[PDB]
Amino acid sequence: VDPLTTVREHCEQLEKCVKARERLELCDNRVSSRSQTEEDCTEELFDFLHARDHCVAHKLFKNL
Amino acid sequence: RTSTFALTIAVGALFFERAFD
Amino acid sequence: EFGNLARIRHVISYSLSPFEQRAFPSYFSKGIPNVLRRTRERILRVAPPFVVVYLIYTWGNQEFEQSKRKNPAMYE
Amino acid sequence: LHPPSYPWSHRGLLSSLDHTSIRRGFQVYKQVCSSCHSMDYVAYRHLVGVCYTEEEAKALAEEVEVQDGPNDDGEMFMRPGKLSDYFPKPYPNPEAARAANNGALPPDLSYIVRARHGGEDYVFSLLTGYCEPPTGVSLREGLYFNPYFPGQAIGMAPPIYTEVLEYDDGTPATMSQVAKDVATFLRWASEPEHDHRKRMGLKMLLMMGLLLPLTYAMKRHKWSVLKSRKLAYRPP
Amino acid sequence: AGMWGTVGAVGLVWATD
Amino acid sequence: HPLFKIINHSFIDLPAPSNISSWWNFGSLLGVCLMVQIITGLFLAMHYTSDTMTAFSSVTHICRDVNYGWLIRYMHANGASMFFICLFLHVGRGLYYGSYTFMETWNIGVLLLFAVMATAFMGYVLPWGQMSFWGATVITNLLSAIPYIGTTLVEWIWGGFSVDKATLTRFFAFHFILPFIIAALAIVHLLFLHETGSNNPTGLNSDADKIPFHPYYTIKDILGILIMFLILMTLVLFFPDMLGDPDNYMPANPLNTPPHIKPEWYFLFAYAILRSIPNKLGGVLALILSILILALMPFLHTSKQRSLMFRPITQILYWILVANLLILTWIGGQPVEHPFIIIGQLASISYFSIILILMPISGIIEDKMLKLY
Amino acid sequence: SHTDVKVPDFSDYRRASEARKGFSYLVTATTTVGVAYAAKNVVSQFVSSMSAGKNMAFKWRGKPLFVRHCTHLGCVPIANAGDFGGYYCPCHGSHYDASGRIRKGPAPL
Ligand code: HEC
Ligand code: HEM
Ligand code: HEM
Secondary structure (H helix, E strand, C coil): CCHHHHHHHHHHHCHHHHHHHHHHHHHHHHHHHCCCCCCCCHHHHHHHHHHHHHHHHHHCCCCC | CHHHHHHHHHHHHHHHHHHHC | CCCCCCCCCCEEEECCCCCCECCCCCHHHHHHHHHHHHHHHHHHHHHHHHHHHHHHHHHHHHHHHHHHCCCCCCCC | CCCCCCCCCCCCCCCCCCHHHHHHHHHHHHHCHHHCCCCCCCEHHHHCCCCCCHHHHHHHHHCCCCCCECCCCCCCCCECCCCCCECCCCCCCHHHHHHCCCCCCCCCCCCHHHHCCCHHHHHHHHHCCCCCCCCCCCCCCCCCCCCCCCCCCCCCCCCCCCCCCCCCCCCCCCHHHHHHHHHHHHHHHHCCCHHHHHHHHHHHHHHHHHHHHHHHHHHHHHHHHHHHCEEEECCC | CHHHHHHHHHHHHHHHC | CCCHHHHHHHHCCCCEECCCCCHHHHHHHHHHHHHHHHHHHHHHHCCCCCCCCCHHHHHHHHHHCCCCHHHHHHHHHHHHHHHHHHHHHHHHHHHHCCHHHCHHHHHHHHHHHHHHHHHHHHHHHCCCEHHHHHHHHHHHHHHHCCCCCHHHHHHHHHCCCCCCHHHHHHHHHHHHHHHHHHHHHHHHHHHHHHCCCCCCCCCCCHHHCEECCCCCCHHHHHHHHHHHHHHHHHHHCCCCCCCCCHHHHCECCCCCCCCCCCCCHHHHHHHHHHHHCCCHHHHHHHHHHHHHHHHHHHHCCCCCCCCCCCCHHHHHHHHHHHHHHHHHHHHHHCCCCCCHHHHHHHHHHHHHHHHHHHHHHHHHHHHHHCCCC | CCCCCCCCCCCCCECCCHHHHHHHHHHHHHHHHHHHHHHHHHHHHHHHCCCCCCEECCCHHHCCCCEECCCCCCCCCEECCCCCEEEEECCCCEEEECCCCEEECCCCC
């Protein structure tokens, strides 16, 4: 089991990542929300990504 | 003494090198 | 060269031996209070510009950030 | 996307590289990354480190026969290598790599970390950041979505998975463990002197902490004379 | 001056090692 | 003794002002640096070849194998950065304290700057990385802007249709000579100055209070050398790549280019200026003027006081000038997109208007306030 | 006049005699030592940078490896020539026997 996966999961659990994920989830849901639109979400995706990733590094390397 | 001043200093630098190295 | 420089007259210039004066007068203790005085005097004229700058940089960064920021509504 | 921060141990100011990992990352390169990438500027001699001493390097030095030796005409690949043997190359010619890389180029990774802005992080992120393409994703040829990758069309095939390889040390070969470990090695190779230097820097800080107040004290001795000079004007 | 020759020699050995 | 007389005349019994601050250290630091850059450049030249074939490699070898190469190479690079830091602070001292009224010293001076700038491009292009290659093409093409003889000149310098080995080898020599060249020009500098003596921060005639240089401004220069060496070695031994661009470690892709291409920090603003002027030629000219405006500086002094110690309005204008110089340094870094561009355009307009217009008008106003005008 | 003004009080700067001097010298001595320490280090590594009846040879280790069935100035002895049936160095006339022993000429060993 890659600690990366576990830590990623854990960070996601962090309410901060939870909310960041909320954004992403709302936004990825938004990706599918409209077709003619350009709601790529790459921006929001990246938003959550970085936020969560910060948390990951904040608590991954030690497990590593 | 000035000459000894330099002398001891040269020797001081001499040993300090080894110690610091 | 020294000599033949300026017609300076009647300017007694007392001095003290280096080994006779305290070797290292406290700088933090005595000098820095005046340094603080010195710096505070000019800073009042030095930081103002930089005060402005930081603002420019900050505003610019976020502005450019929003610029890149795409609106789902845009082309929606 | 701006790669976030990461707590690399060696990155510690006075601390140095963890050779164990470095070793592990050299294994990772030898078993996975060397099929398209090669540490050209690195030689088995360069490879030497606590991770691998010349002796171990020799094993690896003798572990290869690719282009280590030439033949009657020095063509193709004709003989194994030794300590001086430089790192083997997955491709004898750029075209070869291009051919075996979607036409794209798998860059030798000798100075790769230095090359990439925020390399150590980038590397880790790229190798472990393919993430998910939410929309508008049309990977053309052997590409792999990766927001960390500039184009999310890396084409650097994801070559690491849980237990992608097996670390000889036995440390669980999780994708991340593998990624982090190889990272260390790559970093180590990019700056074979990282550790060497930091020791100098520590000696430099100690010597400057000794020498700056003493030179300041001399200067203030020879400048005290004037700094105490009292001037008086005595017109007759 | 006599000791200077000696002083230099001492430092020389150090530096030359 | 006719050799010791000049050394005494310029370094021991030279009458120097007693009240010059640390700034006045910086020029001596520059001389020490030049020495450092040059000596480092020698070893960098050693074990190095001007061949695109082996230039990038032996250097990597220097970084990897050359005995203490990593140390001499990064000392050379960060010493070029330290040279430009000390150069900018030296020029800022000359602008603030009214030292440009020593006109011959200033002109040897302004020329010196252009030269040092070139040596940078020289040293820069030489490792043959991705960034060096694409940087060279860029500035060499700057020349093409010339109205009639531009194309020829560019091709001449390149030595061919496009920068290639022909360039690398010749750029190597200039980068081996310009250093020697600038060195001499500096010697001219020291002569054209001793004829007049150094200036003091009050800007007044310091003939009544002058002291020797050997025991007073020598130990001060030694202390400044020690502090500059501390900053240089903490730049080399602890953060060896905070000022460079990682692109360097990429053998030049004669074919590919760095998505983000930027000239080095020391010149960043210079190019920032270019980016601002829409016309290519305009940019080149403004760019040149950016450096040349300084030479023009001794003819713009309209005040009856030499220094800015007793001139607060021109002090405010000077610090606004330093402020938008820092702004232009930042903009150069930023990519081409709103609103970085507008700032660049304004910052350049404000830079030229403060140097050309605002400071002499402010000096006239300051003379009017003291009932002098 | 000559006596109207007495020397102003420098006690503010005045330090409490050879002991004081010795201490100051001691300082200079240590600093010189520091300079020297750095010198040996810098100079050494500084200099360190520049640091790294028939015969047949295979250039082993970058030098001619004579195998058969100049001590003087380093040329290649020419096999199968000379007055001692071994070797001869066309540079200064050193004749080596088949054993490679210098027999005639100026070659030292
Ligand atoms: C079996 C194939 C394969 C393996 C295994 C592989 N790569 Fe790659 N890699 C490629 C190809 C193909 C490219 C060229 C992509 C391009 O040029 O667009 C590439 C390019 C790259 C680049 C250049 C991307 C950039 O930022 O410019 C990096 C970095 C890279 N790989 C890292 C790695 C690392 C790190 C590993 C393992 C720890 C690895 N690769 C293993 C095939 C591979
Ligand atoms: C005559 C003396 C000099 C010689 C022989 C010399 C030689 C060299 C050589 C061989 C290189 C390539 C090695 C390397 O990549 O670092 C180089 C690089 C460089 N030199 Fe010089 N140089 C000299 C003086 C200077 C000076 C005075 C400057 C500053 C203006 C300068 C700035 C540079 C820069 C910026 C580089 C690029 C460093 C890098 O790769 O990041 N050099 N020099
Ligand atoms: C090659 C780079 C340069 C070197 C090595 C250099 C070196 C020196 C030195 C050693 C001095 C005497 C010390 C001093 O005055 O503090 C000096 C003085 C001076 N330099 Fe420079 N200089 C350089 C470039 C410049 C430039 C570009 C300017 C103009 C902006 C300039 C303006 C001056 C002035 C005005 C003085 C006299 C200042 C004073 O003493 O009051 N120099 N320089």
